[PDB]
Design a protein around this ligand. Structure first.
Ligand SMILES: [Zn+2]
Ligand SMILES: [Zn+2]
Lengths: 153, 153
């Protein structure tokens, strides 16, 4: 029953804590937590390749894409492993995250342990924006806050 | 051929970047980088068990100890896996770290990916301080900076 945690920090007001849980080996991963400081609405929410914060969110690299696919939403079969879609902030500025995903894992080749959770500036278009950036980043924009995903108890 | 990296931050002056490189699987890990903000002399330098930064360096737990052993130095047979000994800060408060270890790994059960690098306040006594603290922490004192260890390019 693996568990992970991620503390999200950026250059601005956006901060939060994301929990990860996988009760079965290679079974679904439950992703839940809270992010505050956001503008109201949808924000891209992706696992990026590298858990490298040496240069802020920038050195986390691209959406985690071990199987070399195009960008999609969580419910797409065309997607990066790291494609978790959007999270929704209320007028509050808080996004209560609750996601369940079978593509990310906390063990093996698709493990996101040691990688980076990034919350983005803009709504993720889920690869339907009809341009090359869409199939890359979802047009999700800049990286507002991130942290390395670590093993939790 | 694995690489990892860690940005150490804390509440005070201490901060650094620590790189890990394992050329061969199950082979030596090279841990190198620099930390500034330190008082001159030797400072405990250990891998702690959890990549949990939710309450600062505290939530990192104890030294990484998969084999349930007592605190030792890196050269000792009786050591924790995360027991990397001391690092040395020069007069300018800068510690050039260059360690080669064979017990920590970047994969398998002794993998330090997703765990926490902590630099400590005081010198690590290597488990020989003659008390309980010694056999736990090396009497290395408080956690001055830390970061989660993540996959690097
Ligand atoms: Zn993507
Ligand atoms: Zn120890």
């Amino acid at each position: 029953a693996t568990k992970a945690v991620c503390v999200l920090k950026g250059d601005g007001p956006v901060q939060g804590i994301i929990n990860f849980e996988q009760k079965e080996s290679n079974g679904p991963v439950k992703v839940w937590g809270s992010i505050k400081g956001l503008t109201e609405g949808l924000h891209g929410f992706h696992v990026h390749e590298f858990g490298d914060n040496t240069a802020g969110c920038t050195s986390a690299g691209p959406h985690f894409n071990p199987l070399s696919r195009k960008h999609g939403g969580p419910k797409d079969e065309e997607r990066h492993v790291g494609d978790l879609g959007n999270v929704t902030a209320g007028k509050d500025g808080v996004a209560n995250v609750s996601i369940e995903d079978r593509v990310i894992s906390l063990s093996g080749e698709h493990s996101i342990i040691g990688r980076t959770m990034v919350v983005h500036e803009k709504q993720d278009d889920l690869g339907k924006g009809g341009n090359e950036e869409s199939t890359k980043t979802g047009n999700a924009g800049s990286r507002l806050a991130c942290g390395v995903i670590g093993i939790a108890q």
